[PDB]
Design a protein around this nucleic acid. Structure first.
Lengths: 185, 75, 100, 141, 142, 55, 112, 67, 19, 144
RNA sequence: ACGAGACUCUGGCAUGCUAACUAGUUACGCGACCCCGGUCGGCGUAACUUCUUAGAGGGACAAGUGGCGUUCAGCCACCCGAGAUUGAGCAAUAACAGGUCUGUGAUGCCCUUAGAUGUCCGGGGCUGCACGCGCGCUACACUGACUGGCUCAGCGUGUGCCUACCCUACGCCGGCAGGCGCGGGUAACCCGUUGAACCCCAUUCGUGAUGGGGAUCGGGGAUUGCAAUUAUUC
């Protein structure tokens, strides 16, 4: 359909990139809107080709990690299905809005660096690269040696990051990365 | 660390706390049940299609890893 | 009367020549001559250690010996082609002429 | 009108297994209960009558590709030979267990041989296979 | 009458996936089994990309017997993601007016350039001194 | 007694059973394409065999 | 040796056309002038001049062994122009590597 | 990392001082002239030269050239 | 030939014979 | 059926070991020393036993047929290659050895070598590996 | 001026060329079978060279443009474009007391040369094992293991002067590794359309060192060998 390209069954519109700092650096809508995460790639040839990539694909790329699960996007495109299947049946919201909510309220606003190390602000693209990596390790730290599956641990990172709950790994990092930086600024 | 002891099959009251109150939950998944009602996880995979054969819950998308159901409709 | 002139060369300048010069000249004699059939390369790969002893670093050779094969389809008795062939012979190509 | 191939290939073996539970005329060999299916496998097949499932599979490995010999039916059912501590390699199936399906589906007129050796699913067999696909490809409407 | 035959290929990796066209009906098939049940079904919509964005009136009278060999699983999907798209686009060059082909190309330039233009990427040659092309073995210092 | 006990190895398998064509040394024989050459001599004289490092 | 019939094999010889260019045809020149027993400082500069007589682009004559004393010496005699790298190392420069057996040791003759 | 070499720059400067006539602004016009006014055993070395020529043919129209 | 030496073996046999 | 029934046996002693009866009934026999998974798939195959329903619902007359096929495998449709003692040095008897016997039959295979002072025997007495392992690298926290 | 680059070879391509029963593809003719019309690596050819193969030129040069910067070299972001940093070889002067005399009928000078340090033939060793290093494999699982099922690869090798030992389809006996017949193939022809693995599909196991993990060890069962115990390998 050329009217609106629904992510399988999920809403392309009613998706608001609410953070005006990360307004340009989350692609979700109308041109970069795809049925799945999975594309050809070519977001790793030049520097600022990475930000044009859809966040649903960036999340899929950021799960297939820890050696055993590298080169298994067939496996984790399917995780992003089962993760999205949950979110509208627990919270009752648009999961792609919940993902944008999961990245906005996770990406740490500053970070300490050595020039006692010195605090400076991050890039917005740094927060995209960080937050997408942060909550995946929270969905890994939870899911490892655990009764719960990936997608529920995945959902318990996206939903808890969507709300501002302090119920997730990624929220306590954003809390403490900004707290480490708060001291030595 | 903290070892947990689960059960193979239902207690009479626990099925009255399953069959009444799991259709009052929204995520009806075999990982939800064996954390909440604390059973041998293999069981909760089998109990949910008997409830589909009973006709309470809705098979959204079944998979090897995770089977996702929800509570009763509105109409 | 399908003559099947096998043209296997180590070199390209002779594989081009021997195949072409047995057609380019065989156009003037007006016999129903076909173009040269191709066969894929066989890269005889022997990868040896550069060092006679086992000391220094492990710099490997990659000795590549490509070999190619052509053959030309014909409607001709044997003697007609034999008049053309043995004139102007060069070292590169192994000309194995099939009668059948 | 259709072939078998315009249907889901997974549940199609449950269509030809629904022909072999119908049948009970197969004259099965004498080793089924305790046997191992390949040199890589560690357990016995989880099915009570796995011979009816592979007979439901082997016939739809004949119509897809015709001229399947026994040493090709060793190849088709192969996995990782997980050799504990050493790196895992490829394994063939077993020379006899797959043969005892190709020697089994000769009595029930489904297979046939030609020149260049090997089984092929007979012209009678293609007619026997297409109309169990319609039985399964009906219910998805 | 006059024939409308088109033979077009598409490449992602070492997959060499060729489509054959004519006049016909709304049917696209790849080695017998059509676009609907080509597993893996996780990548279901990837072959619906040159169909859902266009519709069955673009495939009103185009019968696409796709032959595929070589490559992998995703490499074969992204070969026929591309091949059946170019099989449609090349068909509108010679059997209709030129502006029919131009309009429907821009639908699949604006979406994803993969659908028409192949990726030059191939598996890099492994080098001696490591287990991959751009990788070395752990050398022992101290 | 000496003569029968002079060639009493079964000389049909092993790197000792075979021998080099250049040097008569029993290590590093190129047994691919039947070169049957001590790898040190192959390296030197492969230039006039046809094996050349084009890549 | 190689198991050939009789009548096929027939062996001819000529002078090499400008025979000063082929390296192993002038490695023989430094073989039987040093095995003859002239000092390396004269028998090379004659044959180095012999290719500037023959109009060579350049030279790289490296004579390496026990030249006066027990410690190894290697004299390099270079003038004109010599390329070393790329594909044109094949179809310009010519490899000669020869071993002369003097009573003291073996000197490597590199006529290039 | 595309800095012109001395068999490309000088080779271009030898052409332009001799052949101001045959050359022009467009590359494909004076790409093919280098087949006539240079005997080069290299397709790659030709485009390197003929490309730099045009960059200097845009500098006789805006000022003088150094060499 | 009765032994019928291969065309991989031919240029190797051609090669060593010269060398 | 669906609920925890009556006559539920938490603990059995199927051949003199405290066994957990919550496991799959094929995989419940892993606890007994000499039978793991492979022998226990097949002993509960010879008898008409559906093994999806667990050992919270099994009979104490079920174990009459069980142990006869465990103690005497040969008579009850179990092959020869599938046995652990084959062409036996001692008795020339074919059987699958159970927990009481497995600690014995290996121990008698030691005095098979220990009495004769065999190279294969002496390496068992000391604490080495006998089937051609290398000990230059191995046995760090194993040997003192 | 040499080295660098250029160079040669490759990676990507050209619906333009060049060609072809060892590569195919479409067409029709005919059969397998379908409910007017398809599916089939099954038969034959009638055209063509898209795929496939390798011949030949062609193509990209920072060329078009917006900036940058003394407006010089050049860099950058686009643009249209199969490719806008694909790789690897080859490799300067000058040397090191780097490594091999156990690769050479490359070798000086020595040490041995019937009490052999030559050589030939058995048996052992090369693996030995309180230990400390290095390179790697397989793992600690629920993204997994298991059991069925589904489905696509690309480098490649293969009958030997000495020389014997090849690749293996297909058919018989057997659960297994394996044993036995008729054929092909010196190979785009035969194995092979390399039905590769992973993941994908669906069962099953349940936070416990378990069905994770596969070490150590016992008894058989064959092959390889002239013979394997200090288990060859399965």
């Amino acid at each position: 359909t050329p009217d609106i390209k629904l992510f399988g069954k999920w809403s392309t519109d009613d998706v608001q990139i609410n953070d005006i700092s990360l307004q340009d650096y989350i692609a979700v809508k109308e041109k970069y809107a795809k049925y799945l995460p999975h594309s050809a790639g070519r977001y790793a040839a030049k520097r600022f080709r990475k930000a044009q990539c859809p966040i649903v694909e960036r999340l899929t790329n950021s799960m297939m990690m820890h050696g055993r699960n590298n080169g298994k996007k067939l496996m984790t495109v399917r995780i992003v299905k089962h993760a999205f299947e949950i979110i509208h049946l627990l919270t009752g919201e648009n999961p792609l809005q919940v993902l944008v909510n999961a990245i906005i309220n996770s990406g740490p606003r500053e970070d300490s660096t050595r020039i006692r190390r010195q605090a400076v602000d991050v890039s917005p693209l740094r927060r995209v690269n960080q937050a997408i990596w942060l909550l995946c390790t929270g969905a890994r730290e939870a899911a490892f040696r655990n009764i719960k599956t990936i997608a529920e641990c995945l959902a318990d990172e996206l939903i808890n990051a969507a709300k501002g709950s302090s119920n997730s790994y990624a929220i306590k990092k954003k809390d403490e990365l900004e707290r480490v930086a708060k001291s030595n600024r | 660390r903290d070892k947990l002891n689960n059960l193979v099959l239902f207690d009479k009251a626990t099925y009255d706390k399953l069959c009444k109150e799991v259709p009052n939950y929204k995520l009806i998944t075999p990982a939800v049940v064996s954390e909440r009602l604390k059973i041998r996880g293999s069981l909760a995979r089998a109990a949910l299609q008997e409830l589909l054969s009973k006709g309470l819950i809705k098979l959204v998308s079944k998979h090897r890893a995770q089977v996702i159901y929800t509570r009763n409709t509105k109409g | 009367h399908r003559i099947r002139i096998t043209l296997t060369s180590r070199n390209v300048k002779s594989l081009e020549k021997v195949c072409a010069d047995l057609i380019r000249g065989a156009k003037e004699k007006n016999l129903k001559v076909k173009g040269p059939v191709r066969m894929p390369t066989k890269t005889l790969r022997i990868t040896t250690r550069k060092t006679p002893c086992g000391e220094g670093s492990k710099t490997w050779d990659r000795f590549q010996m490509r070999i190619h094969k052509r053959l030309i389809d014909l409607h001709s008795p044997s003697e007609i082609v034999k008049q053309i062939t043995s004139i102007s012979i060069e070292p590169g190509v192994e000309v194995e002429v099939t009668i059948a | 009108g259709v072939t078998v191939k315009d249907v889901n290939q997974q549940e199609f073996v449950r269509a030809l297994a629904a022909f072999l539970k119908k049948s009970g005329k197969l004259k099965v060999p004498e080793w089924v209960d305790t046997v191992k299916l390949a040199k890589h496998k560690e357990l016995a097949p989880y099915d009570e009558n796995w011979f009816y499932t592979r007979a439901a599979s082997t016939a739809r490995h004949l119509y897809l590709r015709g001229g399947a010999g026994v040493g090709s039916m060793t190849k088709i059912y192969g996995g990782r030979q997980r050799n504990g501590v050493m790196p895992s390699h490829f394994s063939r199936g077993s020379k006899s267990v797959a043969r005892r399906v190709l020697q089994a589906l000769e009595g029930l007129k489904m297979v046939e041989k030609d020149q260049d050796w090997g089984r092929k699913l007979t012209p009678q067999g293609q007619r026997d296979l297409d109309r169990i696909a319609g039985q399964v490809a009906a219910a998805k409407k | 009458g006059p024939l409308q035959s088109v033979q077009v290929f598409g490449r992602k990796k070492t997959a060499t996936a060729v489509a054959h066209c004519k006049r016909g009906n709304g049917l696209i098939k790849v080695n017998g089994r059509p676009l609907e049940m080509i597993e893996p079904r996780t990548l279901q919509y990837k072959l619906l990309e040159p169909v859902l964005l266009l519709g069955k009136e673009r495939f009103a009278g185009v019968d696409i017997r796709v032959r595929v060999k070589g490559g992998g699983h995703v490499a074969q999907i992204y070969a026929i993601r591309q091949s059946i798209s170019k099989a449609l686009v090349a068909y509108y060059q010679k059997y209709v007016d030129e502006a029919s082909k131009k309009e429907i190309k821009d639908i699949l330039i604006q979406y994803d350039r993969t659908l028409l233009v192949a990726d030059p990427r191939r598996c890099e040659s492994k080098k001696f001194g490591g287990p991959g092309a751009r990788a070395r073995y752990q050398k022992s210092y101290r | 007694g000496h003569q029968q006990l002079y060639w009493s190895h079964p000389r049909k398998f092993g790197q000792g059973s075979r021998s080099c064509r250049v040097c008569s040394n029993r290590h590093g024989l190129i047994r691919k394409y039947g070169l049957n050459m001590c790898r040190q001599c192959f390296r030197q004289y492969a230039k006039d065999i046809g094996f050349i490092k084009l890549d | 040796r190689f198991g050939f019939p009789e009548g096929s094999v027939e062996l001819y010889a000529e002078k090499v056309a400008t025979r000063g260019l082929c390296a192993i045809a002038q490695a023989e020149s430094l073989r039987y002038k040093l095995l003859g027993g002239l000092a390396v400082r004269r028998a090379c500069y004659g044959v180095l001049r012999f290719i500037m007589e023959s109009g060579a682009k350049g030279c790289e004559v490296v004579v390496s062994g026990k030249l006066r004393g027990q410690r190894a010496k290697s004299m390099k005699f270079v003038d004109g122009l010599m390329i070393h790298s790329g594909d044109p190392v094949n179809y310009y420069v010519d490899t000669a590597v020869r071993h002369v057996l003097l009573r003291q040791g073996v000197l490597g003759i590199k006529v290039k | 990392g595309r800095v012109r070499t001395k068999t490309v720059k000088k080779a271009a400067r030898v052409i332009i001082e001799k052949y101001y006539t045959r050359l022009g602004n467009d590359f494909h016009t004076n790409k093919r002239v280098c087949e006539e006014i240079a005997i080069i055993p290299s397709k790659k070395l030709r485009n390197k030269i003929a490309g730099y020529v045009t960059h200097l043919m845009k500098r006789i129209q805006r000022g003088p050239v150094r060499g | 030939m009765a032994v019928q030496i291969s065309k991989k073996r031919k240029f190797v046999a051609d090669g060593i014979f010269k060398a | 059926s669906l609920v925890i029934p009556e006559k539920f046996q938490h603990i059995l002693r199927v051949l003199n070991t405290n066994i957990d009866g919550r496991r799959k009934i094929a995989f419940a026999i892993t606890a007994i020393k000499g039978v793991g998974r492979r022998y226990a798939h097949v002993v509960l195959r010879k008898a008409d036993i559906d093994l999806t329903k667990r050992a919270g619902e099994l009979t104490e007359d079920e174990v009459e047929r069980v142990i006869t096929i465990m103690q005497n495998p040969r008579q009850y449709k179990i092959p020869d290659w599938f046995l652990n003692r084959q062409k036996d040095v001692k008795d020339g008897k074919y059987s699958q050895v159970l927990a009481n016997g497995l600690d014995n039959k290996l121990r008698e295979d030691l005095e098979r070598l220990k009495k004769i002072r065999a190279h294969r025997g002496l390496r068992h007495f000391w604490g080495l590996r006998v089937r051609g392992q290398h000990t230059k690298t191995t046995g760090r926290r194993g040997r003192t």
